[PDB]
Point group: C2
Chain length 132, copies 2
Amino acid sequence: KNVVIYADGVYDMLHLGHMKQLEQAKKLFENTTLIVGVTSDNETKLFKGQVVQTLEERTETLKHIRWVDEIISPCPWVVTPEFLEKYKIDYVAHDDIEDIYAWLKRAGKFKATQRTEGVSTTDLIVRILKNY
Amino acid sequence: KNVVIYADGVYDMLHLGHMKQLEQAKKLFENTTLIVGVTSDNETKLFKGQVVQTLEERTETLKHIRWVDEIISPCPWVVTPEFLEKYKIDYVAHDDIEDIYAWLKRAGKFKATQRTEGVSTTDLIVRILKNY
């Protein structure tokens, strides 16, 4: 009855928005194993942009999050069918936002999870940029 | 066999240092209930200094932390004997750093937990204050 869910991402400066996404993935089915994939520093910088925390720092924080059952760190930048078989993954959970998730959706293996705006560590110091 | 542990604090901009402290408190005994107390905005500002996140924001993040079993939010600024009886608390866990914890230590009810330096959300943007 257990369903293996895979949620990959950068998880830089982990905040409430990330945590709610992990909760959502963890709760997609009654009985789940949530695997979190943490992207490598080099690949994140290459394809996305500057990461603040190292792979080891981003991974260590995730270990403390109630919803996280297993961590693949580092994880591949792009999910492949081979990867899904290797780790026996039933669904990939990711924000949605051509479509790199098209093949997962075609297979019935994609579960959208939603971002929370404004709760980011960026915005909190922008907030604190008012005492002056 | 279950031991009730009470760890109070501000828990502003929760980072790895806080999380490791909560892990330490949670793991003080084999079978524990970890109660986290979150201090009020007004009292924190009064006795400590500016808090970045509201009581509700600081409390909501703690809900996502694996080690947290129960939350008292807001909590009293100062622990009292009456408070320990009300919630059936066996030990208070807090960083140590006259001594407001003297009466707890005298009673056998104090468990020191340790801070982690440098891992704070403050230091991460100080870190990012190098790309320029």
